[PDB]
Amino acid sequence: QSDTHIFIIMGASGDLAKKKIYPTIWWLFRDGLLPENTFIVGYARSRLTVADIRKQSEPFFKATPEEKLKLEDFFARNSYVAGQYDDAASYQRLNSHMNALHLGSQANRLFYLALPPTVYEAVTKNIHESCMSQIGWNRIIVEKPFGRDLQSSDRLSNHISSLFREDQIYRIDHYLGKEMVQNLMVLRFANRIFGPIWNRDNIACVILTFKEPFGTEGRGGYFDEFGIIRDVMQNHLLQMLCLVAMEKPASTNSDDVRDEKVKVLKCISEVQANNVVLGQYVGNPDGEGEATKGYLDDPTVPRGSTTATFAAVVLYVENERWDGVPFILRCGKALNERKAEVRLQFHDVAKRNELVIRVQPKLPDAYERLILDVFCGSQMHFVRSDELREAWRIFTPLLHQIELEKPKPIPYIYGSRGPTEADELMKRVGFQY
Amino acid sequence: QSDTHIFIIMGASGDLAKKKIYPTIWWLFRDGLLPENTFIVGYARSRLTVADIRKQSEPFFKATPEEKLKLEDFFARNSYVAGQYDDAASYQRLNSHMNALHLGSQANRLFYLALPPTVYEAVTKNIHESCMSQIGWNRIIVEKPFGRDLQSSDRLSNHISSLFREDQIYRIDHYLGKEMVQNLMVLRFANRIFGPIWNRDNIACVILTFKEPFGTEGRGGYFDEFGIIRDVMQNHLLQMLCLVAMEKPASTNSDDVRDEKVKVLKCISEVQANNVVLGQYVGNPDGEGEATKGYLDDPTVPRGSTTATFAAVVLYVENERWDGVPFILRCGKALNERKAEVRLQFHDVAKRNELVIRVQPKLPDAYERLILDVFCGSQMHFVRSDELREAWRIFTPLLHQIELEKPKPIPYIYGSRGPTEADELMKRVGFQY
Numbered sequence: 001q002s003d004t005h006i007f008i009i010m011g012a013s014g015d016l017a018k019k020k021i022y023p024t025i026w027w028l029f030r031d032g033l034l035p036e037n038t039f040i041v042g043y044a045r046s047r048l049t050v051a052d053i054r055k056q057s058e059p060f061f062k063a064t065p066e067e068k069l070k071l072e073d074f075f076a077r078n079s080y081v082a083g084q085y086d087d088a089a090s091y092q093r094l095n096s097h098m099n100a101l102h103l104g105s106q107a108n109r110l111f112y113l114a115l116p117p118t119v120y121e122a123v124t125k126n127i128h129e130s131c132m133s134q135i136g137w138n139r140i141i142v143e144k145p146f147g148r149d150l151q152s153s154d155r156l157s158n159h160i161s162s163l164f165r166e167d168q169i170y171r172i173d174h175y176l177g178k179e180m181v182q183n184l185m186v187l188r189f190a191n192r193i194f195g196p197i198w199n200r201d202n203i204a205c206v207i208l209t210f211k212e213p214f215g216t217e218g219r220g221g222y223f224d225e226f227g228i229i230r231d232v233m234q235n236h237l238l239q240m241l242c243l244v245a246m247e248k249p250a251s252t253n254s255d256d257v258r259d260e261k262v263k264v265l266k267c268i269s270e271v272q273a274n275n276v277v278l279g280q281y282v283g284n285p286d287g288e289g290e291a292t293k294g295y296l297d298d299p300t301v302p303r304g305s306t307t308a309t310f311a312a313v314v315l316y317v318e319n320e321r322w323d324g325v326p327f328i329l330r331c332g333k334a335l336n337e338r339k340a341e342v343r344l345q346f347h348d349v350a351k352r353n354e355l356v357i358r359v360q361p362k363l364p365d366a367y368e369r370l371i372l373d374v375f376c377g378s379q380m381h382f383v384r385s386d387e388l389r390e391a392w393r394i395f396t397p398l399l400h401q402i403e404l405e406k407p408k409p410i411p412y413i414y415g416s417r418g419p420t421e422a423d424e425l426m427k428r429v430g431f432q433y
Numbered sequence: 434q435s436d437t438h439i440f441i442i443m444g445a446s447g448d449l450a451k452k453k454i455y456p457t458i459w460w461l462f463r464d465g466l467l468p469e470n471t472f473i474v475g476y477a478r479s480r481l482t483v484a485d486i487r488k489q490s491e492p493f494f495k496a497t498p499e500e501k502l503k504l505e506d507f508f509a510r511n512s513y514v515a516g517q518y519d520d521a522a523s524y525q526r527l528n529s530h531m532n533a534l535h536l537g538s539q540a541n542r543l544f545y546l547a548l549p550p551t552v553y554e555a556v557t558k559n560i561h562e563s564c565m566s567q568i569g570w571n572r573i574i575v576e577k578p579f580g581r582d583l584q585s586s587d588r589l590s591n592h593i594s595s596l597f598r599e600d601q602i603y604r605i606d607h608y609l610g611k612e613m614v615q616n617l618m619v620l621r622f623a624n625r626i627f628g629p630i631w632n633r634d635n636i637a638c639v640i641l642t643f644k645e646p647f648g649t650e651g652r653g654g655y656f657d658e659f660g661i662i663r664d665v666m667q668n669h670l671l672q673m674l675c676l677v678a679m680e681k682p683a684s685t686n687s688d689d690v691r692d693e694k695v696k697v698l699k700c701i702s703e704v705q706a707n708n709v710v711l712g713q714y715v716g717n718p719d720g721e722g723e724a725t726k727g728y729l730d731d732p733t734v735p736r737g738s739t740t741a742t743f744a745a746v747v748l749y750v751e752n753e754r755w756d757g758v759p760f761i762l763r764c765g766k767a768l769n770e771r772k773a774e775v776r777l778q779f780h781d782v783a784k785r786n787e788l789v790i791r792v793q794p795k796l797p798d799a800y801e802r803l804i805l806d807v808f809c810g811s812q813m814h815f816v817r818s819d820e821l822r823e824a825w826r827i828f829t830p831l832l833h834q835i836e837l838e839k840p841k842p843i844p845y846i847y848g849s850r851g852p853t854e855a856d857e858l859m860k861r862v863g864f865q866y
């Protein structure tokens with residue numbers, strides 16, 4: 001709204017800030033992609049200085065010796081405030097420090113909640129009363145997990161949105177690849193092209209695939225508390241199902257396309273276990289490297305976890321355009337390839353034909369383009385509150401059933417395509433009407 | 434029309450019969466794909482016996498020792514008649530020999546003109562009066578060249594069709610690959626699918642590609658009398674342009690789809706030299722094998738031939754569906770890859786997007802399926818007389834200009850993508866309307 005932006009990294013001492021946030025804002029500043037008059041303010045309990053953050057974070061900058069002048073300028077625009085996350089006087093110190101900066105009264109304020117959502121409720125509250133800007137805009141970036149089921153997510157989201165309008169809430173998701181936004185970009189363009197063709201009439205079956213060739217790799221501990229449905233399917237695969245099935249948006253406003261996505265979601269009823277095949281990856285005997293270790297063989301995994309590392313799920317959009325048309329969401333870790341495709345099978349009058357859409361896995365990458373979108377205010381590649389609510393409604397009964405019955409997942413060897421029961425399930429839904 | 438078929442190989446002593454016709458009918462008979470009561474009658478001037486043909490042709494059968502019983506039966510259904518191609522008594526001997534066979538009076542008669550078209554005028558005449566069947570159907574297979582320009586082709590075609598109805602004339606073309614019919618099959622299916630999308634509105638540019646990685650290889654002599662336009666473009670690439678641009682056929686009759694193809698051709702005006710880039714391949718210095726030899730370095734090529742071995746051409750379909758939409762026909766020998774694709778570029782509102790259709794280069798191959806089509810009477814993958822006339826009309830002014838002015842083709846190294854002037858020409862027709 002003006003020329004002066006303050007980038008507040010709430011929880012600047014942590015892993016996400018050290019390894020990712022600080023490096024990518026350094027890159028955006030270096031490549032000249034930030035607003036010229038930008039200040040960076042870390043905020044966290046541990047008593048640090050800008051020098052400490054530089055010490056522990058510049059290793060990840062890939063800083064070359066001919067970049068040292070812009071790098072010194074960058075850290076000259078940097079500052080750090082210690083404080084507690086529910087302490088009034090602490091947020092007072094933060095707010096007045098920001099007011100002290102050049103044009104800071106005025107300035108736009110972008111809060112990055114690099115914190116476990118467990119503290120979100122406190123932070124979003126205190127910001128709301130203490131640190132919001134009176135002139136410039138205020139935009140909060142919230143991070144996964146957006147809850148773990150419909151109930152928890154509704155609690156967290158109702159809290160956040162009772163304090164900020166939806167054009168201030170940016171739910172960010174970026175851990176699946178540098179090519180991650182181009183996926184949705186080309187699926188939007190492809191929906192615009194192929195709209196008149198994408199019917200129940202021409203299409204018999206739609207499969208969306210996210211295969212990764214690596215395992216959990218010494219971090220199965222974190223993954224185990226969520227599952228492959230929460231990690232890849234409920235958020236990403238579901239959005240690209242939306243982008244495939246949606247109608248022509250009213251325009252290219254972020255909100256018309258998000259309206260169409262939510263209109264899609266409101267016609268998918270809740271997925272049930274018979275339409276689901278869960279799998280867990282085991283070590284490769286004859287392979288080598290991280291392949292000799294399986295999932296349970298990761299030290300950080302609790303003994304005997306039934307957490308699925310692979311899932312195949314069948315959804316149905318239930319309107320006049322798509323009915324009895326099965327949408328097959330297939331994803332998993334430690335597979336054969338690193339594939340991220342969308343196939344659409346057709347009705348022949350001949351073998352059987354099929355259209356394929358692949359991201360071969362514009363120079364700003366996924367997370368970089370996302371931070372630039374929050375700067376520009378382009379909310380397109382962020383999930384809206386109702387979109388999130390509908391996703392969680394679709395998947396919560398199933399996740400609850402898993403957590404209750406601990407259904408033993410189907411084992412598959414590191415490097416396999418996955419359980420053959422998944423191919424069984426695909427073969428089963430040859431609807432033919 | 435019954436159960437008894439007589440396969441007459443006119444000119445059975447020659448290369449096409451020895452190396453291809455006799456082997457593939459052996460394969461069709463072996464795999465049980467011929468009518469049960471089929472007889473094979475070779476006819477040619479040189480005084481041979483069935484034993485001689487077996488001697489000189491079984492080497493190409495890939496006959497295994499457990500196939501010798503069906504092979505003996507096959508040659509038991511074989512017979513050979515010597516005669517001249519414009520000698521009345523010779524065709525009398527042929528006709529009465531056929532009448533002597535079991536049910537031969539009755540029998541369907543399939544004449545394969547394995548002969549240089551220079552004698553076609555005689556053969557088709559004599560057959561017409563002497564050897565046609567009174568009960569069964571009569572079908573003639575004519576072979577390339579179908580003339581070399583509009584005038585010669587009209588002469589030969591008017592002669593052939595003043596004696597046979599068009600549902601008796603099968604113009605066969607099969608020298609570009611075993612996967613050659615599946616190309617047109619999938620392009621027909623794709624036109625049926627994407628019809629509502631293929632407009633001037635969504636598509637900005639359509640390119641059709643036929644790259645081969647090998648040279649002429651010791652046979653540049655034959656190629657040199659025709660050119661890459663006559664070899665690949667005027668016949669094959671042009672038909673698949675037809676299959677892309679055509680309207681929805683009235684049905685799946687061979688003749689409704691061929692009607693739509695001809696309707697396409699009648700709206701392409703004659704290609705002119707400024708929209709054409711000709712190229713000729715030279716030896717690869719640092720490569721090896723047939724790559725060290727160029728085109729002129731083939732001994733069978735006349736010294737100093739300007740014959741193009743690569744051509745890039747721009748056509749325009751001129752109706753309401755396609756207007757100012759450039760169709761780029763790009764083909765050539767001794768290139769980098771063995772690609773056979775169709776690309777369709779779109780109109781963005783973003784880089785630039787594009788749909789691709791590739792034959793990855795149903796168990797009966799190209800030529801095998803073609804002979805089975807002439808048996809079944811499926812004229813779909815054969816060019817009709819008006820289709821041929823229109824193709825020749827499109828390309829004859831250009832070919833005449835080349836033969837007159839001997840324009841020195843652009844040299845390109847064995848293994849290259851081709852002349853960069855071809856990429857220039859593609860870049861030039863960014864129409865933008």
Ligand SMILES: NC(=O)c1ccc[n+]([C@@H]2O[C@H](COP(=O)([O-])OP(=O)(O)OC[C@H]3O[C@@H](n4cnc5c(N)ncnc54)[C@H](OP(=O)(O)O)[C@@H]3O)[C@@H](O)[C@H]2O)c1
Nearest residue numbers: 011013014015016044045046114115116117143144145175
């Ligand atoms: N794939 C994924 O889903 C994924 C991957 C990476 C990160 N994330 C998300 O990124 C966000 C940031 O995570 P992170 O990687 O930066 O980890 P983090 O180190 O746990 O959090 C960063 C900072 O949070 C503060 N903190 C952590 N636990 C706390 C607690 N219980 N009470 C109070 N303060 C606490 C600490 O600051 P002080 O000690 O100075 O107060 C710490 O330096 C989280 O929401 C996480 O879910 C998600």
Ligand SMILES: NC(=O)c1ccc[n+]([C@@H]2O[C@H](COP(=O)([O-])OP(=O)(O)OC[C@H]3O[C@@H](n4cnc5c(N)ncnc54)[C@H](OP(=O)(O)O)[C@@H]3O)[C@@H](O)[C@H]2O)c1
Nearest residue numbers: 444446447448449477478479547548549550576577578608
């Ligand atoms: N890519 C292509 O375009 C391509 C490739 C291969 C073949 N073809 C076509 O296939 C057809 C058959 O050709 P082919 O490969 O079998 O070659 P071919 O050996 O020239 O012809 C086969 C037989 O034709 C007879 N013959 C040849 N020239 C003659 C002449 N001037 N007068 C009378 N009889 C003559 C001979 O039989 P007798 O001596 O016993 O009478 C010879 O054994 C031709 O139309 C040719 O264009 C096209």
